[PDB]
Design an enzyme around this catalytic site. Structure first.
Site, PDB file in Angstrom:
ATOM      1  N   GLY A   1      -3.994   3.786  -2.011  1.00  0.00           N
ATOM      2  CA  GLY A   1      -3.153   3.008  -1.031  1.00  0.00           C
ATOM      3  C   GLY A   1      -3.818   1.743  -0.712  1.00  0.00           C
TER       4      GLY A   1
ATOM      5  N   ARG B   1     -10.333   0.192  -1.309  1.00  0.00           N
ATOM      6  CA  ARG B   1     -11.069   1.388  -1.808  1.00  0.00           C
ATOM      7  C   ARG B   1     -10.860   1.210  -3.154  1.00  0.00           C
ATOM      8  NH1 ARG B   1     -12.798   5.651   1.741  1.00  0.00           N
ATOM      9  NH2 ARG B   1     -10.614   5.650   3.063  1.00  0.00           N
TER      10      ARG B   1
ATOM     11  N   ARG C   1      -0.349 -10.501  -3.541  1.00  0.00           N
ATOM     12  CA  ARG C   1      -0.302  -9.983  -2.444  1.00  0.00           C
ATOM     13  C   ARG C   1      -1.655  -9.169  -1.683  1.00  0.00           C
ATOM     14  NH1 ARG C   1       5.216  -8.969  -0.466  1.00  0.00           N
ATOM     15  NH2 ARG C   1       6.804  -9.873  -1.948  1.00  0.00           N
TER      16      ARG C   1
ATOM     17  N   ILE D   1      -5.738   9.132  -5.565  1.00  0.00           N
ATOM     18  CA  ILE D   1      -6.526   9.937  -4.549  1.00  0.00           C
ATOM     19  C   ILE D   1      -6.301   9.030  -3.186  1.00  0.00           C
ATOM     20  CG2 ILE D   1      -7.971  10.602  -6.324  1.00  0.00           C
ATOM     21  CD1 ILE D   1     -10.009   8.444  -6.004  1.00  0.00           C
TER      22      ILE D   1
ATOM     23  N   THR E   1      -7.110   9.901   1.530  1.00  0.00           N
ATOM     24  CA  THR E   1      -7.247  10.683   2.700  1.00  0.00           C
ATOM     25  C   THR E   1      -6.015  11.355   3.080  1.00  0.00           C
ATOM     26  OG1 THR E   1      -7.056   8.866   4.004  1.00  0.00           O
ATOM     27  CG2 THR E   1      -9.542   9.264   3.330  1.00  0.00           C
TER      28      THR E   1
ATOM     29  N   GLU F   1       0.728  13.178   4.178  1.00  0.00           N
ATOM     30  CA  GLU F   1       0.225  11.807   3.669  1.00  0.00           C
ATOM     31  C   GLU F   1       1.770  11.160   3.670  1.00  0.00           C
ATOM     32  OE1 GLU F   1       1.004  11.011  -0.013  1.00  0.00           O
ATOM     33  OE2 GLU F   1       2.109  12.864   0.907  1.00  0.00           O
TER      34      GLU F   1
ATOM     35  N   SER G   1      -9.950  14.130   5.698  1.00  0.00           N
ATOM     36  CA  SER G   1     -10.954  13.258   6.814  1.00  0.00           C
ATOM     37  C   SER G   1     -10.609  13.810   8.248  1.00  0.00           C
ATOM     38  CB  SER G   1     -10.648  12.109   6.379  1.00  0.00           C
ATOM     39  OG  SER G   1      -9.205  11.620   6.795  1.00  0.00           O
ATOM     40  N   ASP G   2      -9.344  14.127   8.655  1.00  0.00           N
ATOM     41  CA  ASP G   2      -8.870  14.381   9.944  1.00  0.00           C
ATOM     42  C   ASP G   2      -8.294  15.798   9.960  1.00  0.00           C
ATOM     43  OD1 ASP G   2      -9.801  11.717  11.372  1.00  0.00           O
ATOM     44  OD2 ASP G   2      -8.774  11.216   9.617  1.00  0.00           O
TER      45      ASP G   2
END
Lengths: 233, 233, 233, 233, 233, 233
Positions: free
Chosen positions: C20, C24, C43, C88, C90, C179, C203-204
Site C-alpha cells: 500500500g 515501503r 501521484r 505484502i 501489515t 486489512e 503488527s497490532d
C-alpha cells in the site's frame, strides 16, 4: 387527459406548488390567490390555477407516500409541461438543530424506499433538489427575515416507523426531519429534467415529543406558504 | 499523531482544500501560497499549510477511492479539527450538458459503493455537500465570471467501469460526470458534523471521447484552484 | 502511458511485489534489491525494477482501499503484462490463533465492499489467491523456519470500523486479521487470469490491544520482505 | 382522532370495504347502503357507514400506493377497531388467463417495494390474505354465479413502470395483474392480526392494450361491489 | 441422537468422507473398506465406518443442496466429533481449462445462496477449504500421478439454472465447474472450526456438451475415491 | 430419463404426494395404498405408484431444503407430466395459535432463501399454493372432522437457525411454523404452471419446547396422510 388529472392541457402554470393535502391546496388558493379557479379533482385530489400578486401560479395535491407523489409529479411534467415544482408540507423533526415552527429546505432526501434502486441500477441515487430553486429559497428567506434551515430529510415509506431507534443516527447524518415524498419528487424531477424543491415546517418534534396545537399550526404553515409564493415571484 | 497523518496539532488551519493527487497539493502550495510549509508526508501523501491573501489555508492529498478519501477526512476532522473541506479534482464527463473546461459543483454524489448502506441502516443515504459552502462557491464563481455547472456526480468504486453502457441512464438523472471520492467525502462530513463541497474540472468527456491537451489541463485546473482559494479567503 | 503509471512498456518484470505504502516500496528497493531503478512516480505512487538473487523483481505501490488497489493492478496486468503479484503489508489481527509478528497467508479475502457483487452477477464471489503461489509461499516459509498462519482476511472499505462488535464473529469464521485490499487484488487477478497472493504481518492485535514497538515493526516487516523475495526467485 | 381519519371510535363498523378512489367510496355509499353517513374527510379522503341487507357496513378510501394504504389500514385497525378489510379496485391485466370484465381474487401479493423487507428481517415475506375471507369470496361469487379468477397480483411502487419487459415473467409465475396496494394491505393486516382480502376488476389489459369503454367501467364494477357486500352478509 | 443421524456416539471416526448420494457412500464402503459397518440410515441417508490400510475412515451421505449438506455437516461436527471432512463428487465443468476425467480441487466456493450473507453480516464471506487438507490433497495427487485442476467452484441453489448465460463470466473469474454444496460445506466448517475440502470429478462439460459414458463414470470416480482414501491414511 | 428419477415414462400418475423422507414415502406405500409398486430409487430417494379407492396416486421423496425439493419437483412436472403435487411433512411451530398434532395449511411460504429473488427480478415473490387445491383441502378436512390451522409458514435454508430471536416477529406476522421446502415447491409450481399445496403436522413447538413421542409422531402423521389421500380421491 391523464389517469389521475382531468385538467386541461395548459391549465397549469409552469410553476406549481405542491402538498400531500388537497385541503391545504385550496386553503392556499382561497387565502392567497386572486383569480382562483379549480382545474383538477380526480380521486378528490385537487389543483388550482390563480395569480399571486399579479403573477400566475398553479397548485396541486400529490397525496401521501413516494409512489403517490411520483404519479402526480410525472403527469404534471410529461403531460402538463410543468417545469418548476415546489413541494411544501409538514414533517417530524428528529434533529436537535430544529425546533418547532422552523422551515427546512431539503438539499437532499434520503430514503428507505426501493424505488430509486429500481430506477438507478440498484446503486445509491443521491436524490437532490434542483440548485437554482434552492438559492432562490435562501435569498427570499433572508429577504424576509426567515431563518431558513438547510439540511437533509429522510423520506420514509412508513408514517408509523418500525425504526424509531435509528432517528438519532439519521439526525447524526444531517437529517433534520422525516417526511414521505421528497425522494420520489427529487428522483422523478431528476428522471425528467425538471426543477424541484421541497420545504417543510416543523409541526411535530419526534425526539422532544413536542407538537404544535392547532393554533400556530395553520399560522406556522402560512408563514411558509408566502415563503414559497414569494420565492416564486 | 494519526497512522496516516504526520502533522502536529495546530499545523492544520480549520479550512482545508483537498486533492487526490499529492503532487497537485504540492503544486498548489508552491505556486499559490505564501509561507507554505509541508506539514505531513505519510505514505508520500503530502499536506501543506500556508496563506492566500493574508488568510491561512491548509492543503491535503487524499488518494484515490472512497475508502482512501474517508480515512484522510476522518483524521482531518477528528484530530486536526478541520471544519471546512473543499475538494477539487478532475472528472470524466458523461453528460451532454457539459464539456471540457467546465467546472462542476457536485450537489449530490451517487455511488455504486456499499459504504453508505453500511453507514446508514442499509437505506439510501443522499450524500450531499454543506449548503453554505455550496453558496460561497456560487457567489465566488459569479464574481470571477466562471460558468459553474451544478448537478450530481457519481462516485464509482471502479476507474475502469464494468457498466459503461449505463453512463446515459446516469446522465439522464443529472449526473454530469464520474469521479471516485465525492460520496465518501460527503458522507464522512455528514457523520462528523463538518462542512464539505466537491468541485470538478472536466478534463475528459467519456461519451464524446474528447480529451484536452496536457497543458490546457494545468490551465483549467488552475482556474478551479483560484476559484477554490478565492471562496475561502 | 496509463493515467496512473508513467513507466515505459517493458519496464516491469513479470513478477511484482506490492505494498500500500510507496515509501515501503522505496524502502524495499534501496535495502533489498540490487540495481533498482525507479520506473513510475505518478501521484507519488512509486514503482521499481531491480534484481534479487540474479532475478528481475518489480515493486509497485497501490495506495489504500480496494478501489485504489484495483486501479493499479488492472493497469499492471493489462498494460505492463505483470503475471504474478505478491502483496505484502501489515494487518490488524482479530483472531486468537495469531499473535504479534505472525505472517498470515490469506487464502480467502472476505469483504464489506460491493465491488465483487457488481463484478459477479450480484452473487457471492469467493475471492481467492492462486494456489500455486500459496504453495510456493508455504514451501519458502518452511525453508526459512517461518510458521505461516493460514486463513481468511476481511478486506474492509473502512479503516475506522462501524462494526467493531462483529470482529468476534469474523474471527469465528477463520478471519485472522483485517486489512483493506486483498479482496480487490484477488478479484482483479481472477478477472484478468493473473496469479496473486496476499501476505500480512501482524503488527497490532485489535482484540487484545498488544502492539509492536517501532524497532519490532521494522524487524517484522523485514522478515516478510525476505519471505517474499525468496518465493519469487 | 388520528392524523388522517376524522371519525370517532364507534363510527366505523368492524367490517370495512376499501377503495383507492374516495369518490368510489361515495358511489357505493349512495347506491348500495341505506342510512349512509359520511364519517371522515381528512385530506378529502372519505369514509362512510351504512347498512346492506340489514347488516352494518363501513367504507373507507385509502389512496394510491403501498405507503398510503398502510397509513389508513393501520389507523382503521389500531384506532377504529376494524377487523375485516376487503379491498376492491381496478387492475391492469398481464396474463392470458384473464380478460376484461374479469374479477381477480389475489391469493398473494408480490411486490417491488422494500417495505416488507423492512418489516420482515430483510427476508421474503409472502404477503397473503386471510383464508377465511377468501373462502367466503369464492362461495359468494359461486352463489352469484360469478367466474372468479384466482391467483397472484403484483403490487408495484410504479404506475408508470420502468420494467415493462418483465410483465411476461410476472404472468408466467401466476401474476394476473398489477396494482399498487395489495402487498401493503396484506402485510399490515398480517402485522396487526386482522383479516384482509383484495379483489380487483380488470379495467385494462397492459399486454393486448385494450381497455374498457366509458360506460363499461362502472358496469362490471357494480357486479363486484355486490360480491363484496354479499360476502359481508 | 440427532434428528438426521441415528449412529451411536463414537460411531464416526474423526475423518469422514462425504458424497451427496448415499448409494455412492454405500458403494465406497463395500468396494474399498475393510470391516465396513453401516452406522446410520435416517431418511435412507446412509453412513458407514470401516478401515482403509488399517486406519479408520467414516463415510456419510449429505443429499443435494447447501441446506441439506449444512444439516449433516453441522451434526457430524457438533455431535459426532468429526474433525476433517472430505467431500468428493461430480460436477458440470464450465471452464475451457478442464476436460472430462479431470479432478478439480476447489480452493474457493462462490454461490448464489443467501446462506452466507445470513451467516456473515450481510457481507461477502469468501468460503474456502482448510489449507492443510488442500496441501495434503495436492501432495497425494502428485504421488499418485494425478494432475489436480485447482480453482473456484460455483455452488448454486439451482440444478436447472436460470442463468446459463452467466457461465462464461463465472469461468472468466476462475470458476472451473458448478455443483451445489461446496459453499455450504466450507461455510459450516468455518463456523465450527473444522477442516474441510471439496474434490470434483468432471463427468460432464456444460459448454462443450461432452459427457462421460456410464463405464467411464465409474472408472473416473474410482480414481478419485483412491485419491481420497489415500490422503486420509 | 432424468438424473434424479429412473421411472419409465408414464409410471407417474398426475396426482402426487411428496415427503422429504423417502422412508416416509415407503411407509405410506405399504400401509395406505393397494398394488403399490416402487417406480424410482435414484440416490435412495424412493418413489411409488399405487391405488387409493381404486384411483391411481403416486408418491415421491424430495429430500431436505429448497434446492433439493426444487430439483425433484421440476422433473416431476417437466418430464413426468405430474399436474397436482401435495406436500405433507413436519415442522416446528413458532406460534401460540397452534400446538402439537395440529395440521397447518400453508397459504404462503416466506423464506430466507435467495432462490425466489433470482427467479423473480430481484423483487418479492409472494410464494403461494394453488387456491383450488387449498379449498379442496379445507373441504376434505371438514368432511373428515379435522381442525385445519391455516396461515403462512417460513421456509428456511437453515435447520439450525442463526435467528431464533426473530421467531416471535414471524409468528406476529402469522407464520405458524418453520419448515424448509414449501417456498421452493410453491415457486417451482408457479414457474411451471402446476398445482401444489403444503400441509404440515406440528411435531415440535420451538417456543414452548414441547415435542412429540416416537409414537405420537406416527399417529398424527397418519391423520395427515389420510387427509392427503382423501383430497386426491
Amino acid at each position: 387527459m391523464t389517469p389521475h388529472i382531468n385538467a386541461k392541457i395548459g391549465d397549469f402554470y409552469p410553476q406549481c406548488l405542491l402538498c400531500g393535502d388537497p385541503l391545504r391546496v385550496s386553503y392556499i388558493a382561497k387565502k392567497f390567490l386572486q383569480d382562483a379557479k379549480e382545474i383538477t379533482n380526480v380521486r378528490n385530489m385537487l389543483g388550482f390555477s390563480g395569480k399571486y400578486k399579479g403573477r400566475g401560479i398553479s397548485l396541486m395535491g400529490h397525496g401521501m407516500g413516494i409512489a403517490s407523489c411520483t404519479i402526480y409529479v410525472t403527469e404534471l411534467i410529461k403531460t402538463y409541461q410543468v417545469k418548476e415544482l415546489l413541494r411544501i408540507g409538514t414533517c417530524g423533526a428528529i434533529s436537535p438543530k430544529v425546533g418547532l415552527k422552523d422551515i427546512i429546505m431539503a438539499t437532499g432526501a434520503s430514503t428507505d424506499s426501493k424505488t430509486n434502486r429500481v430506477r438507478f441500477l440498484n446503486h445509491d441515487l443521491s436524490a437532490t433538489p434542483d440548485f437554482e430553486l434552492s438559492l432562490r429559497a435562501y435569498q427570499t428567506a433572508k429577504r424576509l427575515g426567515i431563518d431558513l434551515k438547510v439540511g437533509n430529510v429522510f423520506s420514509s415509506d412508513f408514517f408509523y416507523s418500525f425504526e424509531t431507534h435509528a432517528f438519532d443516527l439519521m439526525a447524526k447524518y444531517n437529517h433534520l426531519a422525516i417526511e414521505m415524498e421528497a425522494a420520489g419528487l427529487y428522483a422523478t424531477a431528476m428522471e425528467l429534467n425538471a426543477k424541484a424543491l421541497c420545504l417543510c415546517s416543523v409541526s411535530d418534534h419526534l425526539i422532544t415529543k413536542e407538537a404544535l396545537s392547532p393554533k400556530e399550526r395553520v399560522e406556522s404553515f402560512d408563514n411558509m406558504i408566502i415563503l414559497a409564493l414569494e420565492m416564486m415571484s
